[PDB]
Design an enzyme around this catalytic site. Structure first.
Site, PDB file in Angstrom:
ATOM      1  N   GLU A  35       0.799  -1.206   0.000  1.00  0.00           N
ATOM      2  CA  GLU A  35       0.000   0.000   0.000  1.00  0.00           C
ATOM      3  C   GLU A  35       0.843   1.272   0.000  1.00  0.00           C
ATOM      4  OE1 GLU A  35      -3.049   0.430  -0.619  1.00  0.00           O
ATOM      5  OE2 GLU A  35      -3.840  -1.590  -0.345  1.00  0.00           O
ATOM      6  N   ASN A  46      -7.417   9.531  -5.803  1.00  0.00           N
ATOM      7  CA  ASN A  46      -8.119   8.730  -6.802  1.00  0.00           C
ATOM      8  C   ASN A  46      -8.945   9.713  -7.644  1.00  0.00           C
ATOM      9  OD1 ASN A  46      -7.338   6.014  -5.644  1.00  0.00           O
ATOM     10  ND2 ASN A  46      -8.542   6.755  -3.897  1.00  0.00           N
ATOM     11  N   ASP A  49     -13.030   8.832  -8.322  1.00  0.00           N
ATOM     12  CA  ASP A  49     -14.112   9.097  -7.384  1.00  0.00           C
ATOM     13  C   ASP A  49     -13.830  10.263  -6.442  1.00  0.00           C
ATOM     14  OD1 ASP A  49     -12.271   7.555  -5.782  1.00  0.00           O
ATOM     15  OD2 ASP A  49     -13.910   7.345  -4.335  1.00  0.00           O
ATOM     16  N   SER A  51     -11.573  10.657  -4.048  1.00  0.00           N
ATOM     17  CA  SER A  51     -11.245  10.323  -2.667  1.00  0.00           C
ATOM     18  C   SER A  51      -9.724  10.236  -2.603  1.00  0.00           C
ATOM     19  CB  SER A  51     -11.898   8.990  -2.249  1.00  0.00           C
ATOM     20  OG  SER A  51     -11.354   7.879  -2.943  1.00  0.00           O
ATOM     21  N   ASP A  53      -6.377   8.279  -0.474  1.00  0.00           N
ATOM     22  CA  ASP A  53      -5.908   7.236   0.453  1.00  0.00           C
ATOM     23  C   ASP A  53      -4.763   7.851   1.266  1.00  0.00           C
ATOM     24  OD1 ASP A  53      -7.628   5.225  -0.701  1.00  0.00           O
ATOM     25  OD2 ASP A  53      -6.218   5.084  -2.364  1.00  0.00           O
ATOM     26  N   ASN A  60      -8.789   5.104   3.110  1.00  0.00           N
ATOM     27  CA  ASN A  60      -9.634   5.947   2.249  1.00  0.00           C
ATOM     28  C   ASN A  60     -10.528   6.996   2.934  1.00  0.00           C
ATOM     29  OD1 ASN A  60     -12.239   6.216   0.278  1.00  0.00           O
ATOM     30  ND2 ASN A  60     -10.355   5.970  -0.893  1.00  0.00           N
TER      31      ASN A  60
END
Length: 130
Positions: A35, A46, A49, A51, A53, A60
């Protein structure tokens, strides 16, 4: 902070991650590796959408932390996403624990399914004394 492998393993163990909801320490290590590469300041926006991380576990903003700029965002953990970019990972751990309390579990992170699930993940904790 970029954690060294065994330093992270020991920290996660002390924070009670070993076997949390059936998830081995080796699996948490595998997740963090892919990750963020064990980097607490890792952030990933991202574009699709809107959002983002955050942190070592790439938590998220639509569900587990609030950053104000994420559409349709819920705050299940109630934390500011800022807390997940600190060197101290206590908050990131508490958020990760909350995330896996949903029926999905660790499968929520697609990276886990791709590179950890059904694999030999011993390598992530070997030699660490945990």
């Amino acid at each position: 902070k970029v954690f060294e492998r065994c330093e992270l393993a020991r920290t996660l163990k002390r924070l009670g991650m070993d076997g949390y909801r059936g998830i081995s320490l080796a699996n948490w290590m595998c997740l963090a590796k892919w990750e963020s590469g064990y980097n607490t300041r890792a952030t990933n926006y991202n574009a699709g959408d809107r959002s983002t991380d955050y942190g070592i576990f790439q938590i998220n903003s639509r569900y587990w932390c609030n950053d104000g700029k994420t559409p349709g965002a819920v705050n299940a953990a109630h934390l500011s996403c800022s807390a997940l970019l600190q060197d101290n990972i206590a908050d990131a751990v508490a958020a990760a624990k909350r995330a896996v309390r949903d029926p999905q579990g660790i499968r929520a992170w697609v990276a886990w399914r791709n590179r950890c699930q059904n694999r030999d993940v011993r390598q992530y904790v070997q030699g660490c004394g945990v």
